[PDB]
Design a protein around this ligand. Structure first.
Ligand code: ADP
Ligand code: ADP
Ligand code: ADP
Ligand code: ADP
Ligand code: ADP
Ligand code: ADP
Ligand code: ADP
Ligand code: ADP
Lengths: 139, 135, 135, 139, 139, 135, 135, 139
């Protein structure tokens, strides 16, 4: 109960919502855009329309009660940092954030983010790893 | 054995740097010299080249590699043309980063052996990373 | 015998109108209803459809046509994906308007039987039209 | 001698220059951009860098001495109409102009253009014709 | 009856409508924008909302029946030239047009405009004249 | 007798050229050298100067003119400041081109003896020009 | 005694809120209703009005105030016209926020008793605030 | 010696540099733009051209040795927050920052800024105070 919450349902965020659901996990999916919230209705325990930067909507959401909260806001560094800021204020156990660039990463580190994700770069490392496995582990 | 990465953006450059760290040799290539220089220290050989040019593909020796990764980004046309050419050279394993849905669809019909979607794929990784929290 | 034009822009719509004037039957198709209506009076059948969707391609019956013209413009990805699909249906003659050089290059390797370049092609027409001045 | 002149060396204009050259015809190729003029050096009797809207450069060019002058200016209705305007003033026997749209066509008709070309539409008719030939002429 | 018609009710056009009305003249005021048409309701015999570039609306307007028609379209060279083009087709006795610049002037001359107005420059001459009068006519 | 035009745009330059044609002497001034040169042949003296600078106004000798025309355009602030300064120098006749309604309103309270509105004013001219058709 | 603030931006609204906190009565005014509402709870009376309109200035009763602050921002013309009008009403103290140098220059010649430059002025405050560190 | 440093020489920053100088205080003035640095040459002990967001240039500057450092970067929230971030890393005793808006303020609070300045609002309070003084203190 109330273990995972994902804010920002783009390619990255919506993808963790789907995988979680597939794995049988309950998940809180949120976005400011309603068309996005309706797109993940069949995958989330609860899919709410909310502005993550709004300190009150965060309360109506009950976000203070989640062990992990993922901020997957995309090309909006401000909404992303602001949200992570409020989350850190609600003392959320684990806040993971998708970073847009170096600058964003630098502020997130000090803003409270426990883990920063750089999709492009990070996948680059995992692809390198798969390549190595193909030969090293020989297969 | 052989590894070749075409397109040294955040995705492509990252795989070159990782392969290097993991003690692997890698051919790094990009049409932009500035990109090639940024990864020269990580690749066995870093070469400036337009991957859509067959002649540049041959002077490159790309046909001799076991795995070639197409990491072209925004230039979707170059990406699909490049993988079309690599397919003609019968490269054993051609992996391509997909820009979008239509792109993925052409790539699968074009001969891409593996199609990568950084955002989506990383998303699944994070979900699985999230579960392991109680493993 | 059968003629099918996908993409009713200036180029595509024009060919539909001409075929009609020349007493030929033609299937007109476009993803945009507004475009489909604009040529409804010129085609035997004008249908709204996304040419990249295999199911819409089948409910359309496109596989039964002798000549299919892909006149998608700016959406280069839809254009190449659409011709890739038509090729799977073994359409006898698939003619495609090329947006640019890379586009032409993928199209030729993809199975386009004829590649049209309005600007260039019309340019040759005008030159030949210019000479005839003294013929 | 001095039969054809092409102003505007884009896909359309450069293409008539090439075809003319292939057919053994002498041609005057002009453009305001030097990189364009250098690209058609091996196809034109003479390739000059000039602003077709400049009334003087038109004289230095000797354009008044050509039977046919093609205005192949692209996405610049103003430069296109202006040029055709000056050409009509020099009393050029035949002025052909590539039109961008309906509006452009309407002004060109009254401005002096003897023939208006709409590449996209016009090629559409010729493609229809080729299709008909495939079946009608049976081949 | 049906002597003057003004198309384009901006500062320039609306001003001739007002002056005409003050002088006791009947005037046809037209504009595509309704807020403009409503602003000159108390000054024009008839104030209609119409697109001057639309060949049909020009007929519904009855513009073919006016001795003078003023095209006072502003920063829209295309709508301005297009309108003057249609007007010249309806064989209007006198078509006066406000020109935006040199290019516009050049096309209007050939498009049919009987008189071209350049507010800024033209007023400049009249101001020079007033200055001269102050001293020469001594007053 | 003395005439001075500040701001050589279409409006201001035009009055300088007309005064010249009418055999009158005129001081032409503008902050932009390019504008000053364009009218150098029409003015007795064409000087580059920022009309808002009192010192440049004095080295100019503007205070000795009977009529000074402020034809600054878009820079409404410079326009009103310039006329404020000319008023301090008690110039007998200061005529100013108004950019808009608020501008006209400040100018009248500031000391502008005549406020010109090219668009509106020309509009009245045309209406009167229209009537004379049957005079 | 009487205080009137025209223009409820960050600067103007702030002074209204402070005066309120300090137990002072204040007339808040702005052409934008949304701005007027935002400060309705802080002013004795918050009124929507265009400060450039003499009639709205009279129905407002502005002429009865000892201090009137013009805090119009970007609309420099409204700002100078408004202070020009207040000067006609002989308001004892008219303080105006200056947008820039030319603005300050017109304002001083127009009758502004005090000209405020938030950025500059606050800058001096901080410097003096910095020194006091060792006082 | 090395007491005050001001980064960003706009209206706000340049103004504290001037006042400090007038009061006989030594001050370090810095900006990325050279024309700005040259404008405050006669007011600062030292006026250097540097990118405050560059971690190295901050070292060449010797900023680690100042009791107070003012970040007066204007309409560039990113450069402003980034700089304050590096400054907080160098453990500067007092970092004051000009905030552009609420969002900026919120990040600065957590980023390390010891004092946040909102020129417009803050001056508003001081103006209110001057008004009160006029009457209350009666003068
Ligand atoms: N303040 C916010 N609160 C909640 N969700 C937001 C907020 N701002 C943006 N979002 C959502 O986060 C997502 C942005 O991630 P993004 O990568 O841009 O989507 P995509 O990958 O499809 O382009 C969008 O679905 C957007 O609606
Ligand atoms: N035809 C081509 N041949 C070789 N490299 C190319 C070609 N087209 C694009 N590239 C390279 O592929 C890379 C794509 O990464 P990209 O996503 O566009 O930049 P980024 O990852 O920083 O956002 C670029 O560095 C680009 O120079
Ligand atoms: N996937 C698709 N399936 C069917 N039609 C499409 C598809 N994508 C684009 N089109 C249509 O192809 C036409 C291309 O003509 P276009 O050049 O883009 O407009 P225009 O010729 O006026 O400049 C458009 O009318 C567009 O709606
Ligand atoms: N005033 C001018 N005089 C001469 N040439 C011009 C003028 N204006 C534009 N051109 C040229 O006409 C051509 C425009 O045709 P265009 O279709 O835009 O080129 P492309 O097909 O490659 O996009 C360009 O080569 C341009 O430099
Ligand atoms: N096609 C058109 N048909 C009729 N009126 C038009 C057309 N296009 C523009 N107008 C009108 O002509 C006027 C433009 O003159 P303008 O100078 O731009 O107004 P203003 O002086 O207030 O800026 C506007 O009132 C506009 O609505
Ligand atoms: N402070 C000033 N002192 C002197 N001249 C000025 C000042 N400010 C602007 N000007 C000049 O006044 C002229 C105004 O004419 P303008 O309307 O702005 O250009 P245009 O008439 O071509 O549209 C410009 O040439 C400008 O350089
Ligand atoms: N003519 C006017 N009469 C009364 N109030 C006005 C007038 N013009 C502008 N204002 C008001 O003055 C205020 C100026 O503050 P401003 O700086 O423009 O916004 P902000 O302080 O948020 O940046 C605005 O709220 C505006 O509505
Ligand atoms: N990264 C940076 N490092 C140092 N100085 C900077 C940096 N970014 C901006 N600045 C400077 O800070 C100042 C911005 O303050 P600003 O308010 O915009 O100036 P102004 O008040 O004249 O508009 C400018 O002088 C700018 O050059």
């Amino acid at each position: 109960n109330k273990q995972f919450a994902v804010i920002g349902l783009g390619r990255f965020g919506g993808s963790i919502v789907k995988e979680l659901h597939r794995m049988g996990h309950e998940v809180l999916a949120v976005d400011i855009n309603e068309e996005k919230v309706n797109a993940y209705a069949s995958y989330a325990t609860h899919a709410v329309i909310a502005n993550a930067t709004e300190e009150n909507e965060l309360l109506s959401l009950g976000i203070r009660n989640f062990e992990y909260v993922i901020v997957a806001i995309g090309a909006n560094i401000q909404a992303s940092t602001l949200t992570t800021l409020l989350l850190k204020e609600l003392d959320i156990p684990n806040i993971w954030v998708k970073a847009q660039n170096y600058y964003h990463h630098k502020v997130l580190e000090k803003i409270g983010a426990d883990r920063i994700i750089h999709p492009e770069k990070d996948m680059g490392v995992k692809i390198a790893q798969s390549l190595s496995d193909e030969n090293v582990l020989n297969y």
